[PDB]
Amino acid sequence: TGFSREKYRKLARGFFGRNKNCLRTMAPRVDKALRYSFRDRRARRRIYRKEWIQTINAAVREHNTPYNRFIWALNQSNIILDRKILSNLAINEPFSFKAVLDEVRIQAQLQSK
Amino acid sequence: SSCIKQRPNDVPTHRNELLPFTLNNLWNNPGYRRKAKKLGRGIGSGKGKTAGKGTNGHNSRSGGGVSPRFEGGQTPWFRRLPKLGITRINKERPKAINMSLIMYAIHKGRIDSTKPITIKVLHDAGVFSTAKYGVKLVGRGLKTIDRPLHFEVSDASENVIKAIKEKGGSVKCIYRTPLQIREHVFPQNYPINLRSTIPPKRIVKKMENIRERGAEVEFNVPK
């Protein structure tokens, strides 16, 4: 068959039982590993954007704005910054986060409360 | 299918080097041998699971296939349509040789126009190869005739006999069986000169059509 048998046994080293040695189980259980991975990679770029929001949506409510009206100004504003960094900032570099948060409020004439 | 792409002008035949003529440094020009994908031998090839046969029908089987007679029990084209008359009876006909061939040779030097043209003179020159039952002077390329000619053949037609005699010349039609023709063309095999026949009715009725065309005729006359 297509993938050699020296090659199946690499993709199925740490499998359970007869799903590592024998062929009538290993081949379809390696194939699903690769159908899943092709899927889990395009899903990988989804989950982080769910995380990047979820860290921003809680670091920004300490400053008494919610997520939606924050980025609403961010696109109005001149600034290009991503949701990636704004996550990394609020954790690791928090002072600069409040800086960025201020002009965004101001260039949009937004007023927290 | 049979259809294959012509080799373009952009595809190189050479191999970018000057290699010797050894039994290893040989090749032939591409497009000279198509290679069919071996059947039944892989998903990756498009003909593995089934060798292009299909799903389970009759043509999918060993020895599967109806003939080009069959139409589903429906009555075929043969036993439906009517039957026609008889085929030819005179299967033993001369050939038709256009002036465009005998005159082509004369302009070369393969034939002497000053001598009577015969069947052998055309055989040796290379006008034709095989001729049982003689020759006919069916006319295409009449207008190229430049000089007087003197033919001696088995048959001819109206326009040629006319178009020759305008310039001059003549035509003499002869009756000869194959055993006589083959004495004329291949004299080496018939060292005994053969008698002349006396022909039956059917030869006469064709041979009198010829005399009506203004030709000359040679055959043993019946009483």
Binding site: - | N9, T13, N29, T144
Partner: protein, 145 residues
């Protein structure tokens, strides 16, 4: 026997102007390739004498010019340009054989005579679309091969 009905009218419509052809742009490339104006010949031509006997017409003429390529007659004394067809005669091509020398200088000169038609170089011959036999033999004699 004279026709009638539509089978005569169509037979008479050759003497009427045409209705212009809507065409795929692939033709529009071709007619731009084919109607492209001519160019001068790099190798000049010598005239055929008049009142030449047919026994002499089949003979060659003497070359005057120093040419890179040559073309050979047969073992019969005729020029090796021939026509080719399908089984149904829908592809119609002339052929040339027994070529020597720089072929690229032979195609540049050939394409001038055939109104810049498609040329298919093959091993030992050159196929060209369109029956243009008489035009070539009138050109090769007129050079003296």
């Amino acid at each position: 026997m004279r026709a009638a009905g539509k089978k005569l009218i169509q037979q008479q419509m050759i003497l009427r102007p045409p209705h212009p052809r809507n065409m795929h742009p692939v033709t529009k490339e071709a007619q731009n390739r084919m109607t492209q104006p001519p160019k001068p010949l790099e190798f000049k031509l010598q005239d055929i004498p008049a009142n030449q006997t047919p026994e002499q017409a089949m003979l060659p003429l003497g070359v005057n010019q120093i040419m890179p390529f040559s073309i050979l007659r047969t073992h019969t004394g005729n020029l090796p340009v021939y026509r080719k067809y399908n089984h149904n005669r829908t592809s119609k091509r002339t052929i040339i054989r027994h070529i020597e020398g720089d072929i690229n200088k032979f195609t540049e000169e050939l394409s001038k005579v055939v109104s810049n038609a498609e040329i298919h170089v093959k091993v030992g011959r050159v196929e060209v679309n369109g029956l243009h036999k008489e035009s070539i033999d009138f050109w090769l004699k007129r050079l003296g091969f």
